Paper text:
[name] is assembled in a stoichiometry of 2:2:6:2 ([name]:[name]:[name]:[name]). [name] forms a hexameric disc-shaped ring on top of [name], with a central pore lined by hydrophobic residues and has been shown to contain phospholipids.
For cryo-EM studies, the purified [name] complex with the [name] mutation (MlaFEQEDB) was incubated with 2 mM ATP-Mg2+ prior to the preparation of cryo-EM specimen. [name] structure demonstrates tight closure of ATP-binding sites with the Walker A and signature motifs in close proximity, with a clear ATP-like density in between, which is consistent with an ATP-bound conformation. The dimerization of the [name] engages the CHs between TM2 and TM3 of [name], which induces the rearrangement of all TMs. The two TMDs move toward each other. The TMD conformational change further induce the movement of [name]. [name] structure elucidates that the ATP binding-coupled conformational change further collapses the central phospholipid-binding cavity and squeezes out the bound phospholipids.
Author numbering:
A (entry chain B), B (entry chain E): 5 to 267
C (entry chain A), D (entry chain D): 3 to 259
E (entry chain F), F (entry chain C): 4 to 97
The structure:
Amino acid sequence: VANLVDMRDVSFTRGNRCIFDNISLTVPRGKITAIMGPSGIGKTTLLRLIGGQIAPDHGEILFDGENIPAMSRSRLYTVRKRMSMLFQSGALFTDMNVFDNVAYPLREHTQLPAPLLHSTVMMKLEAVGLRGAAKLMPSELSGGMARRAALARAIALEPDLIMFDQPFVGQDPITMGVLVKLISELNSALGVTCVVVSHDVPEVLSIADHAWILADKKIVAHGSAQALQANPDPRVRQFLDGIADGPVPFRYPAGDYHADLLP
Amino acid sequence: VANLVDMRDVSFTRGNRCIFDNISLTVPRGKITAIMGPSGIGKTTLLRLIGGQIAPDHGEILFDGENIPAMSRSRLYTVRKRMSMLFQSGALFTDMNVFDNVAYPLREHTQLPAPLLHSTVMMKLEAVGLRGAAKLMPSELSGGMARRAALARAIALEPDLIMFDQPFVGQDPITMGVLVKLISELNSALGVTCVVVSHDVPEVLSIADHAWILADKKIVAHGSAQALQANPDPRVRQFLDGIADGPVPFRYPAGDYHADLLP
Amino acid sequence: LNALASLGHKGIKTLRTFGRAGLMLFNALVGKPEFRKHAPLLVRQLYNVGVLSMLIIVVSGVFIGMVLGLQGYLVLTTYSAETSLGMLVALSLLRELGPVVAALLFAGRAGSALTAEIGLMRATEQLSSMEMMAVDPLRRVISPRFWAGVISLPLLTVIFVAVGIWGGSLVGVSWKGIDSGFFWSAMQNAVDWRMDLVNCLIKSVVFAITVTWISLFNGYDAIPTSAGISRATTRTVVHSSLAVLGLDFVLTALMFG
Amino acid sequence: LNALASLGHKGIKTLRTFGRAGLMLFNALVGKPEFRKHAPLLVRQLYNVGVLSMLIIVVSGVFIGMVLGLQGYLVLTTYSAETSLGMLVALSLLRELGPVVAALLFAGRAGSALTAEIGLMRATEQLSSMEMMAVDPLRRVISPRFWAGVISLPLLTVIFVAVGIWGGSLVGVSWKGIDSGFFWSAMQNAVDWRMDLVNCLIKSVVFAITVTWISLFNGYDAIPTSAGISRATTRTVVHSSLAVLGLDFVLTALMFG
Amino acid sequence: SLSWMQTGDTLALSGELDQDVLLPLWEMREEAVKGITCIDLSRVSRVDTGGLALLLHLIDLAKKQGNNVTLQGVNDKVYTLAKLYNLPADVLPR
Amino acid sequence: SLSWMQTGDTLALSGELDQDVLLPLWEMREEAVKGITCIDLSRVSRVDTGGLALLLHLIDLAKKQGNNVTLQGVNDKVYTLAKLYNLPADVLPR
Ligand SMILES: Nc1ncnc2c1ncn2[C@@H]1O[C@H](COP(=O)(O)OP(=O)(O)OP(=O)(O)O)[C@@H](O)[C@H]1O
Ligand SMILES: Nc1ncnc2c1ncn2[C@@H]1O[C@H](COP(=O)(O)OP(=O)(O)OP(=O)(O)O)[C@@H](O)[C@H]1O
């Protein structure tokens, strides 16, 4: 099918709040697609709807032709061999060192031999640069090193879809100088569909093929980088640069005010 | 005394590894001082030596004229009323909502009245913009909102020293457009000595008065934004921009090759 | 309103809790089998649940067999009836004090250690990263912990009994000088294989399914905060060891009445 | 080498563990006082430790008083000696089964809930952000949890006894028809205030200091990983309830021998 | 040391409006708001948030049972601490 | 479907070097390394890391009991996957 992830008309509700009014986005097969927006808008909630960890209210999420919430428990973990995910906080197995942590998702789904499961993941720890840290337990890594170890675990299997979730944060500009080249040389060399969610507007716009900017309830703009650079005038070019007013830049939907200050 | 934190000749050892050969830095009283360097170099370890949570091996850490490792247990928590600290991961009290979380360090050391402890922290949640989120427990904040709630708790008391630790990460460029102005308008209006540790070389260099770049064992360069820009030629201007070789850009001190690849 | 609706609010929330616990077990046990990836994992959890708990049952098995030999002797020796001491030690244990006291010591050690583990695993994001790797957490974490708990309890009962009977045979025969032949011969034709030995085996299996189910459910549906895990651990020891003492009265009215 | 040095390696590491636990308590109790900030915090931990554990002691107190009334009656009624049943129920409890079984049920519920809480508090970064706010964690977290544990155990013993004595007075006097006057009058002049009542109070305080110390130390010096907290919870129930059964033999040889 | 007394028709202040010493003036917020036309603020060194949250109350008690109050003698340190906390022109009259 | 057979003096490959189907060639790594001068690699679609880690072993068994091997017919997809993983000129002869 012509594009991998299709969202028809998705809605969501965290008890009382109304995020995702009537969003509808598509992800093509084999191209890096960015996702941006203000803080607390539901970008990580957008990635968790695709994986099936939470369910929408009003739409279908078509992963390669089949619906995600209309899928049973035994079929969901068969489809989930196709999509990996980097988490926001590292979130790696603390009772298991780095070499046994990168080698974990391809010890489950690949029947690779023992000196081939040792040569594959000794290359995955050279892409991010974290080789020689193959014996430290993940309580003596730093915290910017615990993302580069959880970035190798997102690309260890080479699945059909990778859903990154802020990979570039907490990195010096000689390490996110090569972590941006690793994602740009994975879909160029293996054909892996990536989904990059980040807050570095010069970094991921230089590599994505179809970006997306989110606003209050739904999509505000979306097109190739160049075609999404200043051509949407009123609400974009305030988010990409600027401090002053537009439609709701930040400041979570607060209540009155004075009543807050004065007793 | 003329400068707040002075390090004479500090050394450290994480069991076998040798970080901090013979570093010696000073922090002036009332000026924002940056700290930069590659990943996994020990910047968060530099902030934890000042607080006294770990002890050095070869030096004195002079906080306002008195030594930190030569300080007993009952005197250390008397001096620690002067220094707060933002943590890397948010790290806020999960059994206590945001309004009772910002109001926690000034319910211990200030004898403020009840409608003044409610008007002070309802302003602290307006500086970062997180007002109206004064009733959510810290398991339904996002994760970029859980730093703006832990940033208000670092400035709630207005102590003499604030040790930020990556405050700008995971924020859109209309929110770290005002979080950089909050730290620049705190030492300009209250005289608070800040210590900013970050990986955003255009952001914190625009506000700091005496930056510091760290290298393999010790300091590599220091100087105001301009004095520290273009000035130091060989090893600086490779870290600030560039991909190729200098002295040890990244790739943690790995062992031999081949033998890792070939069995 | 308030007395009428809020007891309807807070009773319906228990009907979801019974449904959340039933749906957890059906998805954990009834599954697509794997006999060479769960069998190395069963040996780990048979070690963690059972073997570390074997020291607390041996030492506390000898003690409660001794005090039924000490306080059983002193009240019986005035009537010169100390040759019927074995009918008191080996019938308190084989009927009631065996399956129950070895259940409360199991819900303490193994019951809290399973709830404090799967609770903290859920809070340190190791159950979200495991299920986002096409690895079922109810088949990897819950399933070899249920089968290693339904096995470790009926074997820990017969170690609690067989040192409790021997513990009463240390202060009876050896320390207080009751005869070596009249002691054991009065115990032998008072213990039947159907009423006293199989009906102790049936009691331990029912307590093993009960304790292990409540211990895994309170450590799966727990709030991952600070006091959320501390009051799911308290919720394990109280609820799963009231269902021991509640089911024991029902069973002892059926198998011995 | 290996048999000689590695037993010297692994025995010295225990000498640091005894020193780490002693230095923890001296810095927790011996401190600069505060009687209107720790006293609201003591009421919370007296509720969490004690009051939630009061249901498990009441229900399990009646049961172990009943089975010493059931199995105590059937072995005594052949000699027509059922009017000395109270000397068996109210002396098993006041001497040994009271201070010990109410200690093993305390180290289970309260012993694990304190170790699984301060362990997870240490892993979710709530002890690093508390000590970096000029707030002592050994005076805020450990100190009102030690005093609320040395208080809740000697009061939970006398609730375990007074329903165990009443539990044996339900199947003695009411259910099996022993006389209401000969039962209590044979119990009264066999229980002395110095040998049977104060020597149960002394036993419970020693078990309260022992259980609470091991429960807080294993939840403070624990590895904050996944199985680090699950094997500090197991380390609590085993070590602190072997020191119950180890100190009980020493004390029962001194106060009753 | 927060020292204060009005000049008869203008509430003058002195010292610093810290969080260490503030309760001498929070108790006496009743006799020092009525009949005042302007807060002098002339020789106060610095104002913290535990001294600026009082000023939004010390103005409010003087606005209702007295003359509408005005301000005097700032350092542009209680103004850059006012646009930082986004205080409107109601609570602080610039 | 990984299909392979040498041309008599040159180890030709076909298919894809995936991680799904690789064990037919990992077992027969003994009779197909000796006496070979060049790996043809002509009509293999794509190479993954579970097919490139084999190639650093299939060259090594052919370097020691045979002619020093050379390569042929790449897509510049096993070269951008070689400078990415920082493979030197020893393990892969460019
Ligand atoms: N239990 C919950 N867990 C997480 N988020 C919740 C929960 N309940 C409600 N929410 C809301 O859902 C939204 C989730 O948004 P999300 O976490 O994706 O923000 P984000 O895009 O990651 O922002 P940032 O990148 O700044 O962290 C938040 O605004 C939060 O307020
Ligand atoms: N128990 C431990 N906890 C944390 N770090 C440890 C420990 N033991 C050894 N280390 C080492 O100490 C160093 C600490 O450095 P630090 O965590 O400050 O890096 P960093 O400057 O924060 O890098 P980044 O910003 O990329 O996270 C790490 O390189 C780590 O390898």
